[PDB]
């Protein structure tokens, strides 16, 4: 059994161990077996029998040259078979007989030259068939595709198809219901016979890096005419042959197609115009551009009927002045470009993610910044500086707001959140805030979560700023260099359940403030510098308090604090990882669990 037992009686990975023959010294209950990178080279009849209850079989790169009739005859439960990278020469007419439950068949780079003779026509349960990186030249789907009634995914990418003739799709004309997601990327396409796709319906179609010239692309997209796709994905690969031009006509053909969601995934050419270029996708409901340079675009004002717009990893320079009236959700993230946000005007906007762009806002937050009054979600995390100068006038409905990791300024200069009466989630962790106004959170009634880790307070004393946050159920307050603490702080947080106070600078754990935390269940206090206890009223810990981390500190293990070091032992039914509560003061006795000391005085 040089194999590795990942999940006893269940999952074994005998990968690359020079097996010339299938192991047998393994349990019968086995459901997942990986026999990758082993020189099997001959898959004969009933090769697998030692595993009648198998569900997943990985035969990746096993030099398998010939599979005979009924090699997996006894695998009725097998749903996934992976044969990636095998130099197949002979494939028996009934090699896949017995897999009455096969849903996923992976035959990538298996020397497969034609879909015509692939013996799978009886696997009715087949959901996805991956045959990418093979020698297929024709797109003519076999007749047996009829019996394949549960097929949803077909990967024909990286093959040798060069043209699509009408007759190739004849099989589909006879399968009404047929949620097929097709990938034809990296096939040297150069001709799709006109009218070949008339009344054909795909759920998804991906054609990336298929066409040689712009003219070859426009020609093929014409043969695509009449198609109905739910989601269509075009574009190319960064590490392969790209188009030398992509002018305002490249996408003309899409006008004679019925598309619901569109996505252009990576284009080397620097876009010039955006309105003449995409007006055939105007009726589209979801529009996406990932990794495309749009610096050269002067007008971002056209009113497309798009409802979801997603721009990720694009180079832009000046911030796009969007004025899409029907748009409801906008995802503008991880874009390498400028560093200055400017107003947008999205009257219908409800979801707004503008995170990870290094953007800087010179005046937050108002409805005049976005042009909407229906915003419910707002994510401006991971950006540059965000100066607060308006307490969300017009954004009353915000339920979610994330400023995480963005330098925020003017926080304690007035009540910036005064209008957010419905805000439920709020993360301002590591936003370099310096709380210095006890009205910092006024307005946040409905608030339930509040992550303000990584910051700091004036004088390092935690004031009474939570007195209005009733439904408050979570509250991170770690890394805030807190030292002192107002005893009346948490006193109104009845529903509060968790309360992080980790990695701070406390030296004396207390227990009075937590007296009224009815629902309090968790209370992290780790990575601090506690050891003392300036008040032995150590009984005031809520009746529901289950967990109470106190791991890693600088305890005082000298009789000097026998009174407090004992209380720790007294209730080790609330603590956590005790093998990490090592002592710190005895230069001779350090590293021994505090819940194990000779209390000899």
């Amino acid at each position: 059994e040089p194999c590795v037992e990942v999940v006893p009686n269940i999952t074994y990975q005998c990968m690359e161990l020079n097996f010339y023959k299938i192991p047998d010294n393994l349990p019968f209950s086995t459901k997942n077996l990986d026999l990758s990178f082993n020189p099997l080279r001959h898959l004969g009849s009933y090769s697998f029998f030692s595993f009648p209850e198998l569900q997943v079989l990985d035969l990746s790169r096993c030099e398998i040259q010939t599979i005979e009739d009924g090699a997996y005859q006894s695998l009725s439960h097998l749903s996934t078979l992976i044969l990636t990278g095998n130099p197949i020469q002979s494939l028996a007419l009934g090699a896949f007989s017995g897999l009455s439950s096969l849903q996923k068949l992976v035959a990538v780079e298996t020397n497969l030259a034609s879909l015509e003779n692939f013996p799978i026509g009886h696997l009715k349960t087949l959901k996805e068939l991956n045959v990418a990186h093979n020698l297929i030249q024709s797109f003519k789907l076999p007749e047996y595709f009829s019996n394949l009634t549960n097929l949803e995914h077909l990967d024909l990418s990286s093959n040798k198809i060069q043209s699509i003739y009408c007759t190739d799709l004849r099989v589909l004309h006879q399968m009404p219901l047929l949620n097929l997601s097709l990938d034809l990327s990296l096939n040297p396409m150069n001709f799709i016979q006109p009218g070949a796709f008339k009344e054909i319906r795909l759920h998804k179609l991906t054609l990336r890096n298929n066409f040689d010239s712009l003219n070859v692309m426009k020609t093929c997209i014409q043969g695509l005419a009449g198609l109905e796709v739910h989601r269509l994905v075009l574009g190319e690969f960064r590490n392969e042959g790209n188009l030398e031009k992509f002018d305002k006509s490249a996408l003309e053909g899409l006008c004679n197609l019925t598309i619901e969601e569109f996505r252009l995934a990576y284009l080397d050419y620097y876009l010039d115009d955006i309105i003449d270029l995409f007006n055939c996708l105007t009726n589209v409901s979801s529009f996406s551009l990932v990794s495309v340079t749009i610096e050269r675009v002067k007008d971002f004002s056209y009113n497309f009927g798009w409802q979801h717009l997603e721009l990720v990893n694009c180079k832009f320079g000046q911030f796009p002045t969007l004025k899409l009236k029907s748009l409801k959700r906008l995802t503008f993230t991880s874009n390498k470009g400028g560093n200055a946000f400017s107003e947008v005007d999205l009257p219908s906007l409800e979801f707004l993610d503008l995170s990870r762009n290094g953007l800087s806002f010179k005046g937050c937050c108002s409805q005049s910044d976005f042009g909407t009054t229906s915003l419910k979600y707002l994510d401006l995390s991971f950006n540059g500086v965000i100066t607060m100068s308006s307490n969300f006038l017009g954004l009353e409905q915000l339920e979610h707001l994330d400023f995480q990791h963005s330098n925020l300024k003017q926080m304690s200069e007035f009540s910036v959140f005064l209008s957010l009466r419905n805000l439920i989630y709020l993360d301002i962790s590591h936003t370099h805030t310096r709380v210095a106004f006890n009205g910092i959170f006024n307005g946040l009634s409905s608030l339930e979560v509040l992550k303000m880790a990584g910051n700091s307070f004036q004088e390092n004393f935690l004031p009474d700023i939570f007195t209005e946050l009733r439904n408050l159920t979570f509250l991170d307050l770690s890394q805030c260099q807190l030292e002192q603490l107002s005893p009346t702080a948490f006193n109104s947080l009845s529903s509060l359940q968790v309360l992080n106070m980790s990695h701070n600078n406390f030296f004396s754990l207390d227990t009075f403030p937590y007296k009224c935390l009815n629902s309090l269940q968790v209370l992290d206090y780790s990575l601090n510098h506690i050891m003392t206890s300036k008040k032995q009223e150590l009984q005031h810990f809520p009746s529901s308090l289950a967990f109470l981390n106190l791991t890693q500190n600088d305890f005082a293990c000298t009789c000097e604090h026998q009174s407090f070091l004992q209380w720790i032992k007294d209730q080790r039914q609330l603590l956590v990882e005790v093998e990490r509560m090592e002592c710190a003061t005895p230069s001779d006795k350090q590293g021994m669990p505090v819940l194990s000391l000779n209390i000899t005085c």
């Binding site: 100068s389 307490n391 006038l393 304690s412 007035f414 009540s415 005064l418 106004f437 006890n438 009205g439």
Partner: protein, 140 residues
């Protein structure tokens, strides 16, 4: 000790007292009266300083219903070819001017606001005057 009444709008009521020893008189008119929901008008002042207005600046100590906001330094007159003409004013010069103002964009709680406005000016710079503004706000 006397409280002076500036004006009332529909949002607020503004008045002031002194917070300094010497209580040199000032004339303060606001037209129209300030509205915390956003307003813009002319602020007419008449004063005769006891120091030079050279490099003037207010230190502001605002207070929201018992709550305290950090100090605020607002500069009027940086010191060279300034925006306002009254910066040039000398120790005993009559200052009869009209300053325009405007603002908008912030929602304030309901309640009592008090703002101590300590004015400072001069080359070695010493206090000019101290006033404590009491402004009552009733929203909606």
């Amino acid at each position: 000790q006397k409280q002076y009444w500036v004006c009332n709008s529909s949002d607020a009521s503004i008045s002031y007292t002194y917070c300094d020893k010497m209580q040199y008189p000032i004339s303060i008119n606001v037209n129209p009266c300030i509205e915390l929901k956003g307003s813009k008008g002319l602020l007419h002042i008449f004063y005769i300083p006891r120091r030079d207005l050279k490099q003037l600046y207010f230190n502001l100590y605002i207070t929201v219903n018992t709550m305290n906001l950090p100090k605020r330094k607002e500069v009027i007159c940086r010191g060279s070819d300034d925006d306002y003409s009254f910066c040039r004013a000398l120790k005993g010069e009559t200052v009869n001017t009209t300053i325009s103002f405007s603002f908008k964009g912030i929602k304030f709680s309901k309640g009592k606001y008090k703002c101590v406005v300590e004015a400072i000016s001069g080359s070695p710079e010493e206090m000019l005057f101290c006033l404590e503004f009491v402004i009552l706000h009733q929203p909606n």
